[PDB]
Amino acid sequence: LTKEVLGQALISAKNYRDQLYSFKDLFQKCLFARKRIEDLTHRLFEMET
Amino acid sequence: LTKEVLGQALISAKNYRDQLYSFKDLFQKCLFARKRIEDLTHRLFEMET
Amino acid sequence: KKIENTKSLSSEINSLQKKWDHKNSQYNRLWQEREQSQNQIRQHESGME
Residues with Cβ within 8 Å of residue C41, at least 6 apart in sequence? B30, B33, B34, B37
| Phi (first) and psi of residue A23, to 5 degrees | -60, -40
How many CA within 13 A on the CB side of residue A14?
A: 8
Q: How far apart are CA B31 and CA A30, in angstroms?
A: 14
Question: Are residues A32 and B33 in contact, defined by beta-carbon separation less than 8 angstroms?
Answer: no
| Interface with C, mutate which of B43, B45, B48 (most C CBs under 10 A) | B43
Q: How far apart are CA A40 and CA A46, in angstroms?
A: 10
Contact of B32 with chain A, judged by CB distance below 8 Å, is answered with: yes
By what technique were these coordinates determined? cryo-EM
> Nearest CA of chain B to the CA of C1: how many Å?
35
**DSSP line for C1-49:** -HHHHHHHHHHHHHHHHHHHHHHHHHHHHHHHHHHHHHHHHHHHHHHH-
What secondary structure letter does DSSP report for B35? H
Q: Resolution reached, in Å?
A: 3.5
User: What's chain A look like in SS3?
Assistant: CCHHHHHHHHHHHHHHHHHHHHHHHHHHHHHHHHHHHHHHHHHHHHHHC
